[PDB]
Design a protein around this ligand. Structure first.
Ligand SMILES: [Zn+2]
Length: 51
DNA sequence: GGATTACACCCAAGACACCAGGCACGAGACAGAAAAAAACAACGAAAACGGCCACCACCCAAACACACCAAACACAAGA
């Protein structure tokens, strides 16, 4: 498994002002995903066929 | 009446529904409700007996008068 980067760790990163490190811990070191939203209704009901 | 009560990490151990009355269909019986007839109200037609005008005579009502009684100004008495 992986180690939990909990809420108090986020508080310490925020105190340090390290925004890029926080974004990288929570996205690229974890469940990063790409979704499509509708520019009109703003719901994730867009049907994307990428191929 | 609800709702919240440290943070991170390690390990082990058990279960991962079974079994029982309701829906459908599955058939009777008085009750939810429908059909009928006979004693219920009235009206048409005949019978004779109760109701209305006479006739009628005896009992209650009015007039006359009697004596009797209740009563009312006032001459007299009285404080
Ligand atoms: Zn849309």
């Amino acid at each position: 498994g992986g180690l939990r980067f909990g809420e108090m760790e986020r508080d310490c990163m925020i105190a340090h002002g390290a925004a890029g490190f926080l974004k990288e811990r929570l996205m690229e070191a974890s469940d990063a995903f790409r979704v499509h939203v509708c520019g009109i209704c703003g719901l994730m009901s867009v049907i994307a066929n990428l191929k």
